[PDB]
Amino acid sequence: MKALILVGGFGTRLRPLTLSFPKPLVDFANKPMILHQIEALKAVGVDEVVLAINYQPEVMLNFLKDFETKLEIKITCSQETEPLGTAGPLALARDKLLDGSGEPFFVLNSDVISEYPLKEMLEFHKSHGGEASIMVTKVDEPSKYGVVVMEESTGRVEKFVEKPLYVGNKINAGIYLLNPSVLDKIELRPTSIEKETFPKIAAAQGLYAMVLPGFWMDIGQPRDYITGLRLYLDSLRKKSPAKLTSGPHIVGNVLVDETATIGEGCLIGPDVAIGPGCIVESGVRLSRCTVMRGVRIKKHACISSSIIGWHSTVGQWARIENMTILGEDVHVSDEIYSNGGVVLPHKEIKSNILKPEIVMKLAAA
Ligand SMILES: Nc1nc2c(ncn2[C@@H]2O[C@H](COP(=O)(O)OP(=O)(O)O[C@H]3O[C@H](CO)[C@@H](O)[C@H](O)[C@@H]3O)[C@@H](O)[C@H]2O)c(=O)[nH]1
């Protein structure tokens, strides 16, 4: 059984984090983004995973090479030449997805986080004997996504419309399970899976949708990255609560790597992820933030609703809030305030950053 992960490019919308590591390698909840999906694929018996990418794969071959041996799984890159769309790279990796076993393959959107009930999706797939299965989840604004109108009891989808006028409340969750026959409806040309391939399969009465249990989020923009960690950590509390840390210094759900250190007098939480090798000194306040590998938060600093990149340094009594994104190896001096700062890697912040909402929503004029 095979799987393909639609990655895309390096990730412009996630700068300055993606100036150091490509989109699938950026840490989410203390492990590289791509590992959340590769681990879920291995759990259901996938033996090879193809990364449909846009860039030179040498930059991430060192990362995957250890995870290949560690997870006992094969990872190959399928770099495209020209923009092939969302169904194009499915045909560019036709030789890698079809081994002759006749078994279906998974297709995952790399920007999507969920619980991945792939085992239940596999038995759902065999039950209806259809050509393609897709996961669906409800949202409040089904207009920024692609609505899947479907019939109950069977799950057969009736149409796959994109950028719709309320046509339904279920949307494509970016988790596909496709039979080998799907690859016959895709040419080796730029083609869109949501506009062409899925409507065809629905017309042939062979497209089925399964309601996705649990959380779902498309972490494209860093604002959704903060919301994504909250939903993930809530899922972790329900499935395996012992993986979250607790104590008098903890409020809500906090995920601390085993090699991180927390000094006395801290107040960490809610919705905080502290990466490996981190040093949180005394009297630090962290909330709704991601602290990546190897950063140091000095005494009495207060970080909220922000993302501190790898190997950054936050000075004593520094105050970081309101979606501040620090790149790799950013040094924030003592007693500095940052509101909405977006700092390129390796920079030293010696002056305050003042980009509040009232400031930005007033500079429009
Ligand atoms: N190999 C390759 N990958 C691409 C390309 N274009 C986009 N991708 C990647 O495929 C994924 C889909 O991203 P978009 O093309 O921007 O579509 P979308 O607006 O985000 O919406 C789609 O995803 C939602 C999440 O499941 C769906 O809800 C929605 O229905 C739709 O399928 C992303 O990870 C993107 O990097 C391409 O030309 N080639």
Short mmCIF file of C-alpha atoms and ligand atoms in Angstrom, two decimals:
data_model
loop_
_atom_site.label_atom_id
_atom_site.label_comp_id
_atom_site.label_asym_id
_atom_site.label_seq_id
_atom_site.Cartn_x
_atom_site.Cartn_y
_atom_site.Cartn_z
CA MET A 1 0.00 0.00 0.00
CA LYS A 2 1.25 3.44 -1.06
CA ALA A 3 0.51 7.05 -0.19
CA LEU A 4 1.14 10.47 -1.75
CA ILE A 5 1.43 13.74 0.19
CA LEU A 6 0.58 16.90 -1.77
CA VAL A 7 3.21 19.28 -0.40
CA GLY A 8 3.60 22.13 -2.88
CA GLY A 9 6.35 24.71 -2.42
CA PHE A 10 8.62 25.97 0.34
CA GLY A 11 5.75 27.93 1.91
CA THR A 12 5.72 31.68 1.31
CA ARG A 13 2.74 32.17 3.64
CA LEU A 14 4.78 30.71 6.53
CA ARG A 15 7.80 33.02 6.27
CA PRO A 16 10.13 33.68 8.02
CA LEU A 17 9.89 30.13 9.39
CA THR A 18 10.19 28.65 5.89
CA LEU A 19 13.39 30.59 5.15
CA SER A 20 15.24 27.92 7.18
CA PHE A 21 13.24 24.72 6.56
CA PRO A 22 10.59 23.89 3.93
CA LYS A 23 6.88 23.78 4.81
CA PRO A 24 6.70 20.03 5.70
CA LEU A 25 9.76 20.22 7.98
CA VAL A 26 8.57 23.10 10.18
CA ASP A 27 7.89 21.79 13.67
CA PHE A 28 4.29 21.41 14.83
CA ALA A 29 3.67 20.13 18.36
CA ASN A 30 7.40 19.36 18.84
CA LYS A 31 7.80 17.15 15.74
CA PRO A 32 8.26 18.03 12.06
CA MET A 33 4.93 18.71 10.35
CA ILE A 34 5.34 15.85 7.87
CA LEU A 35 5.88 13.27 10.62
CA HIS A 36 2.30 13.63 11.90
CA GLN A 37 1.05 12.19 8.60
CA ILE A 38 3.86 9.71 7.89
CA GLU A 39 3.35 8.19 11.34
CA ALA A 40 -0.39 7.88 10.69
CA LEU A 41 0.28 6.24 7.31
CA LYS A 42 2.71 3.72 8.82
CA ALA A 43 0.08 2.89 11.45
CA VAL A 44 -2.31 1.64 8.73
CA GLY A 45 0.29 -0.38 6.79
CA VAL A 46 1.66 2.07 4.21
CA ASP A 47 5.18 1.04 3.23
CA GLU A 48 6.13 3.90 0.87
CA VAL A 49 5.19 7.59 0.92
CA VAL A 50 5.71 9.94 -2.03
CA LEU A 51 6.16 13.68 -1.47
CA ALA A 52 4.76 15.63 -4.42
CA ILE A 53 6.92 18.74 -4.07
CA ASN A 54 7.96 21.78 -6.11
CA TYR A 55 11.57 22.33 -4.96
CA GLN A 56 14.90 20.49 -4.94
CA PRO A 57 14.47 17.55 -2.52
CA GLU A 58 18.12 17.50 -1.39
CA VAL A 59 17.35 20.10 1.30
CA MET A 60 15.21 17.56 3.20
CA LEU A 61 16.84 14.24 2.24
CA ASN A 62 18.93 14.33 5.44
CA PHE A 63 15.78 14.67 7.55
CA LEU A 64 13.84 11.88 5.84
CA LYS A 65 16.84 9.52 5.75
CA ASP A 66 16.81 9.14 9.54
CA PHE A 67 13.01 8.92 9.71
CA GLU A 68 13.11 6.22 7.03
CA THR A 69 15.27 3.98 9.22
CA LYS A 70 13.55 5.09 12.44
CA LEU A 71 9.95 4.54 11.29
CA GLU A 72 10.65 1.58 8.96
CA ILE A 73 9.08 3.20 5.91
CA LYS A 74 10.23 4.39 2.49
CA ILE A 75 10.06 8.09 1.58
CA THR A 76 10.58 9.22 -2.01
CA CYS A 77 10.27 12.69 -3.53
CA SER A 78 8.39 13.35 -6.78
CA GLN A 79 9.53 16.82 -7.82
CA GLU A 80 7.35 18.40 -10.49
CA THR A 81 8.68 20.38 -13.46
CA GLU A 82 5.65 22.58 -14.15
CA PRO A 83 2.59 23.33 -11.97
CA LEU A 84 0.51 20.17 -12.34
CA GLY A 85 -2.25 21.11 -9.90
CA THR A 86 -3.78 18.87 -7.27
CA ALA A 87 -4.41 15.89 -9.57
CA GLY A 88 -1.33 16.38 -11.76
CA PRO A 89 1.32 15.05 -9.36
CA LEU A 90 -0.92 12.00 -8.90
CA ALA A 91 -0.07 11.07 -12.50
CA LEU A 92 3.59 12.08 -12.17
CA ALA A 93 3.96 9.39 -9.48
CA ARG A 94 1.83 6.76 -11.24
CA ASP A 95 4.80 4.39 -11.44
CA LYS A 96 5.49 4.71 -7.70
CA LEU A 97 1.87 4.41 -6.53
CA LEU A 98 1.04 1.32 -8.61
CA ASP A 99 3.18 -1.67 -7.64
CA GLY A 100 0.94 -4.33 -9.19
CA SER A 101 -0.74 -5.34 -5.93
CA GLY A 102 -3.93 -3.54 -6.97
CA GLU A 103 -4.26 -1.91 -3.53
CA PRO A 104 -5.61 1.63 -3.05
CA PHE A 105 -3.39 4.54 -2.08
CA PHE A 106 -3.80 7.49 0.27
CA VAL A 107 -3.50 11.14 -0.75
CA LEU A 108 -2.98 13.70 2.01
CA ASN A 109 -2.83 17.49 1.92
CA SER A 110 0.38 18.44 3.73
CA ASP A 111 -1.19 21.60 5.20
CA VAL A 112 -3.97 19.62 6.93
CA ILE A 113 -3.86 18.41 10.54
CA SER A 114 -6.39 15.96 11.98
CA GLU A 115 -6.62 12.70 13.92
CA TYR A 116 -6.27 10.54 10.76
CA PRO A 117 -8.64 7.57 11.35
CA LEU A 118 -7.13 5.81 8.34
CA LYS A 119 -7.98 2.31 9.60
CA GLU A 120 -11.68 3.19 9.85
CA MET A 121 -11.43 4.86 6.44
CA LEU A 122 -9.93 1.67 4.99
CA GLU A 123 -12.83 -0.49 6.20
CA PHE A 124 -15.27 2.22 5.12
CA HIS A 125 -13.63 2.00 1.69
CA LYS A 126 -14.06 -1.78 1.39
CA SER A 127 -17.68 -1.68 2.59
CA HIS A 128 -19.08 0.38 -0.29
CA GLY A 129 -16.74 -1.00 -2.98
CA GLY A 130 -16.48 2.41 -4.64
CA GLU A 131 -13.65 4.01 -6.55
CA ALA A 132 -12.70 6.86 -4.21
CA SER A 133 -13.26 7.84 -0.57
CA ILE A 134 -12.78 11.32 0.90
CA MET A 135 -12.98 12.65 4.45
CA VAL A 136 -15.37 15.53 5.16
CA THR A 137 -15.72 17.94 8.08
CA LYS A 138 -18.12 20.78 8.85
CA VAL A 139 -17.12 24.44 9.02
CA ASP A 140 -19.03 27.66 9.65
CA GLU A 141 -17.95 29.30 6.36
CA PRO A 142 -18.16 26.55 3.68
CA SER A 143 -17.27 29.17 1.04
CA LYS A 144 -13.49 29.31 1.52
CA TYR A 145 -13.40 25.53 0.90
CA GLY A 146 -14.89 22.92 -1.42
CA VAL A 147 -18.30 21.64 -0.34
CA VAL A 148 -19.14 17.96 -0.82
CA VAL A 149 -22.89 17.46 -1.21
CA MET A 150 -23.67 13.87 -0.26
CA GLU A 151 -26.48 11.42 0.44
CA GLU A 152 -26.80 9.93 3.91
CA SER A 153 -26.88 6.18 4.67
CA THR A 154 -24.54 5.43 1.75
CA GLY A 155 -22.13 8.37 1.69
CA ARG A 156 -22.30 8.75 -2.09
CA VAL A 157 -21.33 12.31 -2.99
CA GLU A 158 -23.52 14.12 -5.52
CA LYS A 159 -21.20 16.97 -6.51
CA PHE A 160 -17.84 18.55 -5.62
CA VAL A 161 -18.25 22.32 -6.01
CA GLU A 162 -15.50 24.79 -5.06
CA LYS A 163 -15.72 28.45 -3.98
CA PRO A 164 -19.54 27.99 -3.98
CA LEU A 165 -23.99 30.15 -2.16
CA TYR A 166 -24.48 27.56 0.61
CA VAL A 167 -24.65 24.16 -1.08
CA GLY A 168 -23.87 22.13 2.05
CA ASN A 169 -22.06 22.08 5.36
CA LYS A 170 -19.45 19.38 4.68
CA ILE A 171 -16.07 20.27 3.17
CA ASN A 172 -13.14 18.35 1.72
CA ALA A 173 -10.73 17.56 4.55
CA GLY A 174 -7.82 16.76 2.23
CA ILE A 175 -7.70 13.02 2.98
CA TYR A 176 -8.26 10.80 -0.06
CA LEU A 177 -8.29 7.02 -0.50
CA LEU A 178 -8.19 6.22 -4.21
CA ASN A 179 -8.34 2.94 -6.11
CA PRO A 180 -5.83 2.38 -8.94
CA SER A 181 -8.61 3.02 -11.48
CA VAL A 182 -8.60 6.70 -10.44
CA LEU A 183 -5.22 7.14 -12.13
CA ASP A 184 -6.83 6.28 -15.48
CA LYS A 185 -8.97 9.44 -15.22
CA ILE A 186 -5.87 11.65 -14.85
CA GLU A 187 -3.54 12.65 -17.69
CA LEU A 188 0.10 13.65 -17.25
CA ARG A 189 -0.93 17.30 -17.66
CA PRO A 190 -1.80 20.14 -15.26
CA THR A 191 -5.23 19.22 -13.88
CA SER A 192 -7.24 20.02 -10.76
CA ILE A 193 -8.64 17.17 -8.66
CA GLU A 194 -11.45 19.27 -7.14
CA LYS A 195 -12.73 20.74 -10.42
CA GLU A 196 -12.25 17.81 -12.84
CA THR A 197 -11.41 14.42 -11.32
CA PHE A 198 -13.83 14.35 -8.37
CA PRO A 199 -16.88 15.53 -10.39
CA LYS A 200 -16.21 12.73 -12.90
CA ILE A 201 -16.06 10.05 -10.18
CA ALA A 202 -19.28 11.42 -8.68
CA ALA A 203 -21.03 11.19 -12.06
CA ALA A 204 -20.02 7.51 -12.25
CA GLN A 205 -21.77 7.01 -8.87
CA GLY A 206 -18.46 5.83 -7.41
CA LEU A 207 -17.38 8.65 -5.09
CA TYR A 208 -18.02 8.28 -1.36
CA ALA A 209 -17.52 10.62 1.59
CA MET A 210 -16.90 9.79 5.25
CA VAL A 211 -17.54 12.27 8.06
CA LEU A 212 -14.23 13.07 9.75
CA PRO A 213 -14.42 12.51 13.53
CA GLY A 214 -12.37 14.87 15.64
CA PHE A 215 -10.60 18.13 14.96
CA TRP A 216 -9.50 19.44 11.57
CA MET A 217 -7.48 22.47 10.53
CA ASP A 218 -5.60 23.74 7.47
CA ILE A 219 -2.41 25.34 8.85
CA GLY A 220 -1.56 27.49 5.86
CA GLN A 221 -1.23 30.86 7.62
CA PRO A 222 0.49 31.29 11.01
CA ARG A 223 -2.77 32.46 12.62
CA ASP A 224 -4.15 28.96 12.00
CA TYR A 225 -0.93 27.47 13.39
CA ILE A 226 -1.80 28.79 16.86
CA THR A 227 -5.37 27.51 16.50
CA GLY A 228 -4.01 24.23 15.16
CA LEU A 229 -1.94 23.57 18.28
CA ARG A 230 -4.97 24.20 20.51
CA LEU A 231 -7.09 21.66 18.61
CA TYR A 232 -4.27 19.10 18.52
CA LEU A 233 -3.49 19.39 22.23
CA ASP A 234 -7.19 19.02 23.06
CA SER A 235 -7.17 15.81 21.00
CA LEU A 236 -4.06 14.63 22.86
CA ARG A 237 -5.81 15.23 26.20
CA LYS A 238 -8.68 12.96 25.13
CA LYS A 239 -6.65 10.14 23.55
CA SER A 240 -3.53 9.84 25.74
CA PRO A 241 -3.60 12.40 28.57
CA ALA A 242 -0.30 11.19 30.08
CA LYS A 243 1.60 12.72 27.14
CA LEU A 244 0.65 16.20 28.35
CA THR A 245 2.59 17.64 31.27
CA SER A 246 0.93 18.86 34.45
CA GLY A 247 1.69 20.58 37.73
CA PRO A 248 1.01 23.76 39.72
CA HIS A 249 2.91 25.75 37.07
CA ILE A 250 0.72 24.36 34.25
CA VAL A 251 -2.66 25.67 33.13
CA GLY A 252 -4.57 23.92 30.36
CA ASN A 253 -2.86 21.59 27.89
CA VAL A 254 0.92 21.95 27.58
CA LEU A 255 3.28 19.69 25.63
CA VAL A 256 6.89 19.80 26.87
CA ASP A 257 9.68 17.74 25.32
CA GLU A 258 11.54 15.53 27.79
CA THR A 259 14.85 17.38 27.30
CA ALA A 260 13.41 20.84 27.96
CA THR A 261 13.90 22.57 31.31
CA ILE A 262 11.51 24.86 33.20
CA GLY A 263 12.77 27.02 36.05
CA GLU A 264 10.93 27.71 39.28
CA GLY A 265 8.05 30.15 39.50
CA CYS A 266 6.80 29.75 35.93
CA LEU A 267 3.20 29.83 34.69
CA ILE A 268 2.97 27.92 31.41
CA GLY A 269 -0.24 27.56 29.42
CA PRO A 270 -2.69 27.23 28.01
CA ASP A 271 -1.91 25.65 24.62
CA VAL A 272 1.89 25.75 24.75
CA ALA A 273 4.41 23.49 23.00
CA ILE A 274 8.00 23.61 24.26
CA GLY A 275 10.47 21.94 21.92
CA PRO A 276 13.51 19.79 22.58
CA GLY A 277 16.58 21.41 24.09
CA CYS A 278 14.69 24.48 25.32
CA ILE A 279 15.67 26.44 28.42
CA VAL A 280 12.83 28.29 30.16
CA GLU A 281 14.30 30.23 33.08
CA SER A 282 12.57 31.42 36.26
CA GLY A 283 9.35 33.40 36.36
CA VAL A 284 8.51 33.03 32.67
CA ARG A 285 4.91 33.37 31.44
CA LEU A 286 4.02 31.38 28.31
CA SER A 287 0.54 31.08 26.81
CA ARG A 288 -0.83 30.06 23.40
CA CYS A 289 2.69 29.95 21.96
CA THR A 290 5.05 27.52 20.26
CA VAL A 291 8.64 27.34 21.51
CA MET A 292 10.73 25.45 18.96
CA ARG A 293 13.99 23.54 19.29
CA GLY A 294 16.76 25.06 21.36
CA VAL A 295 15.41 28.50 22.24
CA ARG A 296 16.10 30.17 25.58
CA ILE A 297 13.49 32.25 27.40
CA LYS A 298 15.29 34.27 30.06
CA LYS A 299 13.88 35.15 33.47
CA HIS A 300 10.58 37.03 33.80
CA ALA A 301 9.87 37.17 30.07
CA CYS A 302 6.22 37.02 29.01
CA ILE A 303 5.30 35.47 25.65
CA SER A 304 1.74 35.04 24.39
CA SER A 305 0.17 34.10 21.05
CA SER A 306 3.49 33.89 19.21
CA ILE A 307 5.91 31.50 17.51
CA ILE A 308 9.59 31.54 18.49
CA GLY A 309 11.76 29.93 15.83
CA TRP A 310 14.61 27.52 16.41
CA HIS A 311 17.58 28.69 18.50
CA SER A 312 16.07 32.10 19.21
CA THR A 313 16.73 34.01 22.43
CA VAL A 314 14.24 36.09 24.42
CA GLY A 315 15.78 38.53 26.88
CA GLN A 316 14.88 39.07 30.52
CA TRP A 317 11.54 40.85 31.06
CA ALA A 318 10.92 40.87 27.30
CA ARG A 319 7.26 41.02 26.29
CA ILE A 320 6.12 39.23 23.12
CA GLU A 321 2.47 39.12 22.07
CA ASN A 322 -0.06 39.32 19.22
CA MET A 323 1.20 36.86 16.59
CA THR A 324 4.90 37.67 16.74
CA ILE A 325 6.84 35.31 14.46
CA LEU A 326 10.57 35.05 15.18
CA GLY A 327 12.68 33.32 12.56
CA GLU A 328 15.67 31.10 13.25
CA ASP A 329 18.34 32.37 15.66
CA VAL A 330 16.61 35.65 16.55
CA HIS A 331 18.00 37.47 19.60
CA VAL A 332 15.54 39.70 21.47
CA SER A 333 17.33 41.97 23.93
CA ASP A 334 16.26 42.38 27.55
CA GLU A 335 13.14 44.42 28.37
CA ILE A 336 12.04 44.67 24.72
CA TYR A 337 8.39 44.73 23.61
CA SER A 338 7.21 43.12 20.37
CA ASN A 339 3.62 43.29 19.10
CA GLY A 340 3.09 41.57 15.76
CA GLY A 341 6.79 41.44 14.93
CA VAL A 342 7.81 39.30 11.96
CA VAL A 343 11.60 39.03 12.23
CA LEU A 344 13.88 37.53 9.59
CA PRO A 345 16.33 34.84 10.74
CA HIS A 346 19.57 35.74 12.55
CA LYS A 347 18.42 39.31 13.24
CA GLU A 348 19.01 41.03 16.59
CA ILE A 349 16.04 42.95 17.99
CA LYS A 350 17.30 45.93 19.99
CA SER A 351 14.23 48.17 19.59
CA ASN A 352 10.53 47.71 20.26
CA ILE A 353 8.22 46.43 17.52
CA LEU A 354 4.81 48.16 17.55
CA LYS A 355 2.43 46.63 15.02
CA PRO A 356 -0.82 46.29 17.07
CA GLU A 357 -4.21 45.89 15.43
CA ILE A 358 -5.11 49.52 16.16
CA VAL A 359 -1.87 50.64 14.48
CA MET A 360 -2.27 48.50 11.35
CA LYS A 361 -6.03 49.10 11.03
CA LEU A 362 -5.20 52.84 11.15
CA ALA A 363 -2.28 52.92 8.68
CA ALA A 364 -4.67 51.76 5.94
CA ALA A 365 -5.50 55.44 5.47
N1 LIG B 1 2.74 18.95 -6.49
C1 LIG B 1 1.85 20.13 -6.47
N2 LIG B 1 1.19 20.51 -5.24
C2 LIG B 1 0.29 21.70 -5.21
C3 LIG B 1 0.07 22.44 -6.36
N3 LIG B 1 -0.76 23.42 -6.06
C4 LIG B 1 -1.08 23.32 -4.75
N4 LIG B 1 -0.41 22.24 -4.25
C5 LIG B 1 -0.50 21.79 -2.86
O1 LIG B 1 -1.88 20.95 -2.62
C6 LIG B 1 -2.42 21.37 -1.51
C7 LIG B 1 -3.75 22.13 -1.82
O2 LIG B 1 -3.54 23.51 -1.72
P1 LIG B 1 -4.40 24.53 -2.75
O3 LIG B 1 -4.07 24.22 -4.14
O4 LIG B 1 -4.03 25.98 -2.45
O5 LIG B 1 -6.01 24.31 -2.50
P2 LIG B 1 -6.86 24.99 -1.25
O6 LIG B 1 -7.29 26.38 -1.64
O7 LIG B 1 -5.97 25.07 -0.01
O8 LIG B 1 -8.23 24.03 -0.91
C8 LIG B 1 -8.14 22.65 -1.08
O9 LIG B 1 -7.69 22.06 0.19
C9 LIG B 1 -8.71 22.15 1.23
C10 LIG B 1 -8.24 21.38 2.45
O10 LIG B 1 -8.59 20.00 2.31
C11 LIG B 1 -10.05 21.57 0.76
O11 LIG B 1 -11.07 21.77 1.81
C12 LIG B 1 -10.51 22.20 -0.47
O12 LIG B 1 -11.74 21.50 -0.94
C13 LIG B 1 -9.49 22.13 -1.53
O13 LIG B 1 -9.35 20.73 -1.96
C14 LIG B 1 -1.38 22.36 -0.86
O14 LIG B 1 -0.60 21.70 0.06
C15 LIG B 1 -0.54 22.84 -2.04
O15 LIG B 1 0.85 23.20 -1.57
C16 LIG B 1 0.76 22.05 -7.66
O16 LIG B 1 0.58 22.68 -8.65
N5 LIG B 1 1.63 20.91 -7.69
#
